[PDB]
Amino acid sequence: VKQDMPPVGGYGPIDYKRNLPRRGLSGYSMFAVGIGALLFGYWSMMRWNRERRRLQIEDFEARIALMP
Amino acid sequence: NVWAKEPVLVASFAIAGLAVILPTLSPYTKYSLMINRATPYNYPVPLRDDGNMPDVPSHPQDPQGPSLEWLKRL
């Protein structure tokens, strides 16, 4: 009998592919998302700014009527 | 044509060109001037009564003078 170490029954395949799935989407979608979220933030910032303008005018009314 | 070589330059020129041109077309710069004008830092000083003025109301509740009503309607 012989007791070397051959490949017992053959070994299966071994990959060597450059498998890069390319996660993400196209860049035009990235520009669309960026400009959309940016403009969303601009509109919300505009609304909050003019609300605080209203309250700032009310504080001006306080300092005007409080003075004499 | 140039979008492959120096892209940050072209993006900077595009946003610069819109930052120059874009303030011309506006339904909002008149609102900017009105809101920025209508903020009293100083005291509203009164005036002597009669140079025979059929304007400039005496009670601050009287709406004869130019009030502000475009504020509360945004």
Quote the CA–CA distance of B13 and B35 in Å, as a whole number.
Answer: 31
B41 contacts on A by Cβ (under 8 Å): 60
The answer to whether B71 and A57 have CB atoms below 8 angstroms apart is yes
Alpha helices in chain A (DSSP H): 27-65
Question: Rounded to a whole number, what is the distance in Å from the CA of A19 to chain B's nearest CA?
Answer: 27
Quote the CA–CA distance of A26 and B31 in Å, as a whole number.
Answer: 39
Of the candidates B38, B44, B71, which has its C-beta nearest A64's C-beta? B44
Resolution of the solved structure (Å): 4.1
A64 contacts on B by Cβ (under 8 Å): 40, 43-44
- Contact assignment for B35 to A50 by CB distance below 8 Å: yes
Diameter of chain B measured on Cα atoms:
74
Quote the CA–CA distance of B74 and B58 in Å, as a whole number.
Answer: 28
Q: C-alpha angle with apex A27: B7 to A43, nearest 5 degrees?
A: 90
* Contact A46/B at CB under 8 A: no
- CA-based nearest residue to B15, from A10, A34, A18: A34
Method: cryo-EM
* Contact B41/A at CB under 8 A: yes
Specify the residue for token string 């509203």: B44
Q: What are the tokens at B32?
A: 């900017």
Q: C-alpha angle with apex B40: A58 to B38, nearest 5 degrees?
A: 90
What is the CB-side half-sphere exposure of residue A38 using CA atoms within 13 A?
Answer: 6
- CA-based nearest residue to B35, from A46, A57, A41: A57
Report the chain A residue with the minimal C-alpha distance to residue B74.
A50
CA distances (Å), A17 to each of A14, A22, B32, in order? Answer: 10, 14, 61
